[PDB]
Structures are given as structure tokens and as C-alpha cells.
Write a protein that binds this ligand. Structure first.
Ligand SMILES: [Zn+2]
Ligand SMILES: [Zn+2]
Ligand SMILES: [Zn+2]
Ligand SMILES: [Zn+2]
Lengths: 72, 74
DNA sequence: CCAGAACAGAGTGTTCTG
DNA sequence: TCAGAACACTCTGTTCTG
């Protein structure tokens, strides 16, 4: 019931990992797209519902470390 | 040499709300003071604020504005 | 149930003005 | 001079569709 990325209420298993709908589309957009993501911190940034917009670099790292896969 | 924003280090357009700043930090500060927002640092509150990363942490950005002396009083 | 599309909002940064 | 209004943009998030 809890997104393994941001801790928000999960909508199901997306791309191999239990996640919220916001993290689902964020991950796909991050993989397929082109951005400039740069951590302003130490790359330990806290990712939760309120702060997940703060550091997409760390959020995307968490997605990957959680094992999210587009071909899953 | 161009003038430098004391908040994010971008090119400064002049002195805004008491401090030499870029236009983006000018309008960011006004909106932060007047508005209701959720600003919580995801870091240690030491976050780097520059032109590229200034959008990352409005909490640290606002802190820098205040520490630089920005105010609406004059 | 889930992927992707369609739709919509938050926050930002610029130009324009007196 | 600098403060304010307002538009357009990016990144984001929810509802809809197959
Ligand atoms: Zn999530
Ligand atoms: Zn980070
Ligand atoms: Zn600035
Ligand atoms: Zn911060």
C-alpha cells in the first residue's frame, strides 16, 4: 500500500516495483526523456511525498535502486 | 564584469528588496513571503543554490534570501 | 490490474510598464 | 532606480482508455 520510492500510497506494481502513480510516470519520463538532474545535496536526499519534487536526481536513483524496469 | 546575484549567483539585474539579486530571486522572494507553501529541505539545509539547481530547494533558497537581508519593509 | 494517453495543476522566470 | 502584473514555459500528477 506504500510506494517504495516516495512512501506515498501505492497504486500497484509498476515497472516491477510497488509504487505510486506519480513515481510510475516520473520513472518512464526520466528514462526515455532528456533532463538536467543535479543533486544540490550529498546525493542522500530524503524522498517523500512533500519533498519528492525537490531532487529528481535522487528520486530517479531511488527508482533504479528499487529495481524499476521498463521491460519488466 | 556583470553584477552577481547574492542568492543564486546568476547575473543580477539590480538591488531588489534591499539586496542585489537576479529577477528570478526577486519574484521568488516576494511569492515566498506573501504565500503559503510547503518548503522542507531534503538535505542538511546546506544545499547549493546556483542558476541550475536553484529550483531544487526553495527552502534553502528562501533561507539565503533572508540571510542576505531581503525584506519587504523597504 | 497495468501501461500509456489525455488532461490539468504547481512553481518558476521572463517581458513589459511607469 | 525598482516593484508589480501577467504570460509562457518546464516539470509534474491525476483521470481516462485499451
Ligand atoms: Zn512514489
Ligand atoms: Zn539529491
Ligand atoms: Zn538569484
Ligand atoms: Zn536544502
Amino acid at each position: 500500500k506504500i510506494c517504495l520510492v516516495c512512501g506515498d500510497e501505492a497504486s500497484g506494481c509498476h515497472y516491477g516495483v510497488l509504487t505510486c502513480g506519480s513515481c510510475k510516470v516520473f520513472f518512464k519520463r526520466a528514462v526515455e526523456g532528456q533532463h538536467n538532474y543535479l543533486c544540490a545535496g550529498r546525493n542522500d536526499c530524503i524522498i517523500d511525498k512533500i519533498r519528492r519534487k525537490n531532487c529528481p536526481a535522487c528520486r530517479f536513483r531511488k527508482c533504479l535502486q528499487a529495481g524499476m524496469n521498463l521491460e519488466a
